[PDB]
Amino acid sequence: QYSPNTQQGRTSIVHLFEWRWVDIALECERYLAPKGFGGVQVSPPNENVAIYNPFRPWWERYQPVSYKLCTRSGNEDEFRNMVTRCNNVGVRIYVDAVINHMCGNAVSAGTSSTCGSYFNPGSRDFPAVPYSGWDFNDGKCKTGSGDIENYNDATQVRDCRLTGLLDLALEKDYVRSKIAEYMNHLIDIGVAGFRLDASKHMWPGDIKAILDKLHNLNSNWFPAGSKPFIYQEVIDLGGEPIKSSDYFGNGRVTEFKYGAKLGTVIRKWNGEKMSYLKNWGEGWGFVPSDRALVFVDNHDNQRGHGAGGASILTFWDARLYKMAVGFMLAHPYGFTRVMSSYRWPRQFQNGNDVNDWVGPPNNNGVIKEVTINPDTTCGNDWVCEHRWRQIRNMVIFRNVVDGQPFTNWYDNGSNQVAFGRGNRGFIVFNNDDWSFSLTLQTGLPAGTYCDVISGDKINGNCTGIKIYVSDDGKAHFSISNSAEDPFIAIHAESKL
Numbered sequence: 236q237y238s239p240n241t242q243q244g245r246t247s248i249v250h251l252f253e254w255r256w257v258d259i260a261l262e263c264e265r266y267l268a269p270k271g272f273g274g275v276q277v278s279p280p281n282e283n284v285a286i287y288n289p290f291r292p293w294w295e296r297y298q299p300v301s302y303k304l305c306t307r308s309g310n311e312d313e314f315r316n317m318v319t320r321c322n323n324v325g326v327r328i329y330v331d332a333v334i335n336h337m338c339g340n341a342v343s344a345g346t347s348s349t350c351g352s353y354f355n356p357g358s359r360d361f362p363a364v365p366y367s368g369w370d371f372n373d374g375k376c377k378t379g380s381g382d383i384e385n386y387n388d389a390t391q392v393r394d395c396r397l398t399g400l401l402d403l404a405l406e407k408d409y410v411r412s413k414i415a416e417y418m419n420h421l422i423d424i425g426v427a428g429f430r431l432d433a434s435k436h437m438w439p440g441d442i443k444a445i446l447d448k449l450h451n452l453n454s455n456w457f458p459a460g461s462k463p464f465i466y467q468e469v470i471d472l473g474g475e476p477i478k479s480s481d482y483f484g485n486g487r488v489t490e491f492k493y494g495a496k497l498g499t500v501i502r503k504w505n506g507e508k509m510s511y512l513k514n515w516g517e518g519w520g521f522v523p524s525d526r527a528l529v530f531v532d533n534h535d536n537q538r539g540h541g542a543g544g545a546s547i548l549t550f551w552d553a554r555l556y557k558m559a560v561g562f563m564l565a566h567p568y569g570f571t572r573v574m575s576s577y578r579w580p581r582q583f584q585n586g587n588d589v590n591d592w593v594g595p596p597n598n599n600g601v602i603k604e605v606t607i608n609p610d611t612t613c614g615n616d617w618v619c620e621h622r623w624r625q626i627r628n629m630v631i632f633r634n635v636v637d638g639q640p641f642t643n644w645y646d647n648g649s650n651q652v653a654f655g656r657g658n659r660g661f662i663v664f665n666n667d668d669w670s671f672s673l674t675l676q677t678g679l680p681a682g683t684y685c686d687v688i689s690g691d692k693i694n695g696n697c698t699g700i701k702i703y704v705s706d707d708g709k710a711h712f713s714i715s716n717s718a719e720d721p722f723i724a725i726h727a728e729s730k731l
């Protein structure tokens with residue numbers, strides 16, 4: 236469950252947050268495949284609560300009503316159509332599995348759901364699954380409110396309602412089977428793995444039991460015996476009884492400390508600086524690289540809805556964001572996930588963003604399609620960070636240097652650092668307030684390379700800056716602290 240099951244040469248997955256199935260299908264064919272992306276993390280494909288207060292917020296998708304693959308992103312067929320089409324072009328589909336709970340216990344009963352299924356949070360009836368009061372942790376939870384109250388009590392964190400969400404009795408074979416039933420359907424459709432949402436709120440043992448029920452990937456597309464990829468959503472920043480290591484027996488875990496400390500460093504907060512990144516990875520209290528699913532930001536914290544808090548960088552900080560991602564995408568630690576967002580009317584008051592609830596672009600609740608601008612950017616308010624040259628090109632960089640060790644590290648003792656990945660790649664950063672002009676050992680083969688950040692290698696030429704590597708691997712670099720993109724990236728496949 237540790238292997239992403241991407242096909243050799245693909246090393247990242249993009250979170251096409253709130254994208255419809257038809258749009259993702261097209262993206263696999265038109266961009267993801269030819270650009271070498273490994274897979275797509277999709278929003279919960281199961282029926283959820285239709286919330287109108289606020290209007291169609293993005294979080295209404297983490298409030299399940301049934302397991303019908305029928306949401307704002309599309310019905311079951313469109314999902315199949317997507318999974319097939321993406322697989323046929325070597326691009327995987329990872330499902331955001333919301334299996335810890337159903338909806339808010341206070342949500343009105345009725346048919347206010349994405350597929351119309353009737354449900355009753357009050358009487359705990361989700362006849363579409365079906366689930367009854369026998370399937371929830373009401374009796375098991377020992378808190379006075381019934382919800383999670385104190386994170387220092389590892390039991391209540393798992394047995395009580397996460398902010399009011401009805402907690403499924405995951406120790407019951409019946410519930411385990413209804414979830415596995417949901418996940419295997421998806422597996423047999425061709426999905427390559429899952430994001431186990433709210434894993435901290437699930438017992439490592441209960442998750443295990445649910446995985447023992449899981450099939451092996453669809454043998455039409457995957458090697459026989461392919462276990463689905465599993466990355467548990469667990470927010471562990473230390474100082475809490477629950478550790479992410481407790482979930483290593485079930486697969487990978489999101490390393491939330493990653494984007495938190497990376498944003499702290501890049502933002503140069505509390506005295507932190509890039510030169511500290513030399514021992515990036517485990518040396519920072521992060522989980523083992525082979526157990527880490529890393530990312531700069533995620534749909535939650537890019538809104539202040541998650542771990543990392545204030546230091547987290549997002550597309551809103553576009554300049555430092557490309558730099559943050561550039562480093563993540565060049566560093567060998569973990570399996571990388573690129574965020575792909577949409578613009579929302581963000582507006583701060585007294586420090587918080589009051590529009591963080593705003594769902595994806597839409598017309599009367601109907602998610603707007605992703606339009607592709609002539610310059611490959613997206614319209615309809617989709618940010619499409621994965622289409623930004625500096626990101627998309629660093630996505631390719633990771634594939635090209637895949638396997639190569641981390642070496643030839645350089646730092647000025649401040650914020651201009653550089654390192655290489657074997658003899659296949661080299662990247663330089665300058666986050667200081669002054670120009671960086673120095674000849675560095677790149678460990679690369681002599682020749683002329685295209686800087687993939689400022690430009691691209693096209694027709695046997697570079698559209699942007701060019702680096703010249705000498706017979707001794709040496710190469711001169713020059714980045715102005717006021718440069719549009721304060722970092723240069725060259726690799727084997729950008730060589731003229």
Ligand SMILES: *[C@@H]1O[C@H](CO)[C@@H](O)[C@H](O)[C@H]1NC(C)=O
Pocket residue numbers: 694695696
């Ligand atoms: C590279 O670009 C130059 C113009 O800057 C052009 O003369 C040359 O033919 C190009 N090389 C190839 C291989 O197309």
Ligand SMILES: O=N[O-]
Pocket residue numbers: 430468489530533
């Ligand atoms: O929540 N996924 O990192």
Ligand SMILES: [Ca+2]
Pocket residue numbers: 335392393394395402403436437
């Ligand atoms: Ca729970």
